[PDB]
Design a protein around this ligand. Structure first.
Ligand SMILES: OC[C@H]1O[C@@H](O[C@@H]2[C@H](O)[C@@H](OC[C@H]3O[C@@H](O)[C@@H](O)[C@@H](O)[C@@H]3O)O[C@H](CO)[C@H]2O)[C@H](O)[C@@H](O)[C@H]1O
Ligand SMILES: *[C@@H]1O[C@H](CO)[C@@H](O[C@@H]2O[C@H](CO)[C@@H](O)[C@H](O)[C@H]2NC(C)=O)[C@H](O)[C@H]1NC(C)=O
Ligand SMILES: *[C@@H]1O[C@H](CO[C@@H]2O[C@@H](C)[C@@H](O)[C@@H](O)[C@@H]2O)[C@@H](O)[C@H](O)[C@H]1NC(C)=O
Ligand SMILES: [Mn+2]
Length: 267
């Protein structure tokens, strides 16, 4: 698949239950390290295998390139392809991750694509996934069902009419963090080249799911994905899946809080 870097992992030998694909830019080593030290640490979660990989492209900067080659050598958990890693190539990045699942890890029961400034509660997500009994053509997160493209030309999410010419976006899930059964990766990759491109990755995946007739569903009767962020409490964070707007220091403090308070009960 023209991959420059691949993780040493055999999904055939050890079918992972949950694969996390974390998008971050080259300079966000602090983010990736905070994640490797917290929700990204690989482990058995109720006897299910959790794997974590970081999605990177390439950069002009020779310094950053070397940093990243060193990071890959030292951690063996980077997935890389040769595309200029910038905000407006995030769709390539996402399709890279999806391609990886399709070519090298089709045995993953579930896959989560997430941002770097996130708290992810893998234990509770594992619990909700086992409860859901939806093992194929499954896709969830924070549902965005009737979104209008941003036409303000200076907004970070601006798309012109020629980039996306219709009034509404298909249904999609916030790219802060979305989860799908592993089969979905193959289907999305298969259709990706026949779907109109758009530089917003979560919208693009929504276009593919719509072409595949894969409908978005809520993970649980209570909201569990929070792109807007949350006021922190140990008891709320024990009963959510994902929370955005979390910088590395904060991520570590919250992780420490959840450790310090383990074993205490919450109403
Ligand atoms: O490469 C794409 C990039 O997209 C990011 O998602 C974007 C947001 O989901 C969305 O937010 C616009 C706006 O929508 C309102 O309904 C409210 O929910 C408000 O809070 C929100 O800010 O904007 C665009 C579509 O216009 C989406 O792409 C995503 O978070 C990134 O990780 C990345 O995937
Ligand atoms: C997305 O990545 C592609 C691949 O890296 C970029 O395309 C290249 O851009 C460089 C400029 O940095 C050119 O020298 C190459 O000729 C281009 N090649 C190809 C195959 O595209 C593309 O520019 C990136 N997208 C954005 C918006 O920067
Ligand atoms: C997932 O499946 C669970 C299985 O429990 C037993 O088997 C299923 C097929 C039903 O017959 C159920 O009534 C049995 O107790 C269910 O308990 C569980 O409710 C299912 N998940 C959801 C979200 O409903
Ligand atoms: Mn973010």
């Amino acid at each position: 698949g023209n991959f420059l870097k691949l993780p040493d992992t055999d999904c055939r030998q050890t079918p992972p239950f949950l694969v996390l694909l974390v998008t971050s830019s080259h300079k966000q080593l602090a983010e990736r390290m905070a994640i490797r030290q917290t929700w990204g640490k690989e482990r058995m979660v109720k006897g299910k295998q959790l794997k974590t990989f970081f999605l990177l492209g390439t950069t002009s900067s020779a310094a950053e390139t070397k940093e990243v080659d060193q990071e890959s050598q030292r951690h063996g958990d980077i997935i890389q392809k040769d595309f200029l890693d910038v905000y407006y190539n995030l769709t390539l990045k996402t399709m890279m991750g999806i391609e990886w699942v399709h070519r090298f890890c089709p045995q993953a029961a579930f896959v989560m694509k997430t941002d770097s400034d996130m708290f992810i509660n893998v234990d509770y997500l594992t619990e909700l996934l086992l409860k859901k009994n939806r093992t194929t053509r499954f896709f969830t997160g924070f549902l965005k069902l009737n979104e209008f493209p941003i036409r303000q030309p200076f907004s970070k999410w601006f798309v012109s009419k020629s980039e996306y010419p219709w009034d509404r976006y298909p249904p999609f899930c916030s790219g802060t963090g979305y989860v799908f059964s592993g089969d979905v990766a193959s289907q999305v990759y298969n259709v990706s080249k026949s779907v109109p491109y758009i530089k917003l990755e979560d919208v693009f995946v929504g276009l593919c799911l719509e072409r595949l007739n894969i409908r978005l569903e809520e993970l649980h009767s209570q909201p569990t994905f929070f792109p807007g962020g949350l006021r922190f409490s140990v008891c709320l964070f024990r009963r959510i899946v994902a929370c955005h707007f979390i910088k590395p220091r904060t991520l570590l403090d919250y992780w420490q809080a959840l450790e310090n308070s383990r074993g205490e009960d919450c109403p």
